[PDB]
Amino acid sequence: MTEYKLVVVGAVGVGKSALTIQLIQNHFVDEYDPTIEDSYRKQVVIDGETCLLDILDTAGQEEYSAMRDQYMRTGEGFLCVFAINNTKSFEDIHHYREQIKRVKDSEDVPMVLVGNKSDLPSRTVDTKQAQDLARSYGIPFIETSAKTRQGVDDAFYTLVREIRKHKE
């Protein structure tokens, strides 16, 4: 069982921790709580192989730049999830890209673009534009709805396949 280190990134309001709880113990929370450092270490069966996923929900607040740039080199699987409730999240992607690539020292990284909050009637970002920006990054775009548990498995299964492709 290989341990995969995952780092969740995104703006405040997207509910990163909520997305984790809905996957780990499969529970949804409406309340928001400022997370700092933890480890949602759960084993998942992918392609018939049970792997250990070390999902770490990082602080969405810009008050730990030192700690952030510290072990950012250990960030294997970056979880970039954006919401349609905020259009700025579509711009924040570029900021994250420059931050990640800089510490990764590589332009090639197994990552996917997932859009959540598809249970909201307000769509500030369309599918065409979403896929377009994803293509410019060389990453696949998938729609995910944590609230109704849709596309969660689909997006996760493909992600692992991409990572293994980069590894071997």
Ligand SMILES: O=C1CN[C@H](c2cc3ccccc3[nH]2)CN1
């Ligand atoms: O108790 C803990 C706290 N989080 C640690 C962690 C470090 C790390 C680096 C990169 C991606 C995910 C990561 N998770 C693991 N165990």
